From TrEMBL, chain A:
It is found in: Periplasm. Belongs to the metallo-beta-lactamase superfamily. Class-B beta-lactamase family. Its main location: periplasm. Its EC number is 3.5.2.6. Pfam families: Lactamase_B. It comes from Escherichia coli. CDD domains: NDM_FIM-like_MBL-B1. It catalyses: a beta-lactam + H2O = a substituted beta-amino acid. It comes from the Bacteria. Zn(2+) 5 binds at E118, D189. This is beta-lactamase. NCBIfam families: bla_class_B_core (NF012229), bla_subclass_B1 (NF033088), blaNDM (NF000259).
């Protein structure tokens, strides 16, 4: 089962949406984490010609259905696919809303294999990766601007990252924490030996991205990557 | 030991008409000699190897025993994760012109683990089975990724047309008190991965593993019961 058991910001139900680029938005949803209260989780929405592509669900099915409603209102293009960046509640908790809506879903093969143990619904389709971390293109059909990179084990063994081609943006998901972070967040499923190398591999994979989007903080500069790697260095 | 054969530092045990276990040893601080096992499979007119020995020299001894005892070409080797017992001899396989295969993740981890990457990467479906285009002409070798356990990258191999499945370092002996080296292990998912190996090869009666002699299926259920205690 699951381990879980302001300017420019647009409120839409209990979610928040922020435009990051002409064709890119950040979605934000909240879940109350006993003791510490509201935990934000961010993902992305990308307009690619006549299609919308989603990175990560919200925490819940009901929140994820609200992402689809927001897309209908603000973009009014069909959602061609969603890719989720590992098998934890914040990234995959809303899979049923996507499947209910007939949306094709993608995850790391390992995320799909771990999903039952992690209390998640598996995506319909599985990404695989080359030894250099880049997605095998046959497993990323019509991903368009989404450039998927497996950096190595870090936050989880299955964590993947996504560059948005033709923009300044790369999405570190839960691997990367912001440059102000006092900790690496939830290390319950982390690989402490390989985390630092995986963070640095993400930086090297998207060497010119200037806006680093993350699950649990607002977008940051590239300093988030180096600061995260140096915090991870101390886990070894 | 009666019936076992020696070549240099290597010991070979015939498990089935076309299958041998190779065993090599390394002195580990405060542990004395640690055995590591792999497999040699005769597949008609060619030989397939599962896992290197600890070192290049030991791995060359495997290849020269194969020449002496079997006298068929070695077509390919599959190595079952990026640790020295399984991939320490990659340079000897490459020098001998043997095609090498490992989990893509093993190849990605190899530099950090001080190992040499294989020439080819295996990838796996969500159900754990190797994507067939990545494992061309593997003959009787059936490669399964059971999930993270002993390491994130550990893979397993069934030998079609035999009683044998190879758990590598994921599976420990049915009398074991411990799961051996957990330094790189996934404590949450280990038990499920061990059970997934059992379910992938449900008819295998001889379970070969890295650090103990062949056992029955009891090794799978005992490993899972030990791993349940890690959670
Ligand atoms: C801060 C935080 O809360 C949760 C619930 C997670 S995760 N993605 O590990 O579940 C994290 C994280 O660090 O990613
Ligand atoms: C007993 C043992 O010794 C070593 C050196 C290893 S491994 N494969 O983790 O390096 C193991 C193991 O448990 O696999
Ligand atoms: Zn997570
Ligand atoms: Zn997270
Ligand atoms: Zn977990
Ligand atoms: Zn090992
Ligand atoms: Zn081992
Ligand atoms: Zn290691």
């Amino acid at each position: 089962g699951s381990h879980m058991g302001e300017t420019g910001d647009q409120r839409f139900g209990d979610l928040v949406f922020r435009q990051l680029a002409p064709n890119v938005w950040q979605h934000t949803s909240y879940l109350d984490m006993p003791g510490f209260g509201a935990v934000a989780s961010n993902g992305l929405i990308v307009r690619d010609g006549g299609r919308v592509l989603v990175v990560d669900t919200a925490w819940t099915d009901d929140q994820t259905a609200q992402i689809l409603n927001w897309i209908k209102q603000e973009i009014n293009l069909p959602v061609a696919l969603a890719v989720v960046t590992h098998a934890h509640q914040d990234k995959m908790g809303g899979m049923d809303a996507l499947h209910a809506a007939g949306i094709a879903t993608y995850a790391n093969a390992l995320s799909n294999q771990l999903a039952p143990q992690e209390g998640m619904v598996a995506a319909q389709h599985s990404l695989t990766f080359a030894a250099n971390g880049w997605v095998e293109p046959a497993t990323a059909p019509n991903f368009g601007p989404l450039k998927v990179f497996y950096p190595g084990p870090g936050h989880t063994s299955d964590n993947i990252t996504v560059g948005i081609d033709g923009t300044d943006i790369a999405f570190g998901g839960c691997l990367i924490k912001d440059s102000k972070a006092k900790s690496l967040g939830n290390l319950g499923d982390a690989d402490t030996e390989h985390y630092a190398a995986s963070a640095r591999a993400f930086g090297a994979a998207f060497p010119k991205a200037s806006m680093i989007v993350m699950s649990h903080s607002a977008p940051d500069s590239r300093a988030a990557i180096t600061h995260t790697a140096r915090m991870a260095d101390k886990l070894r």
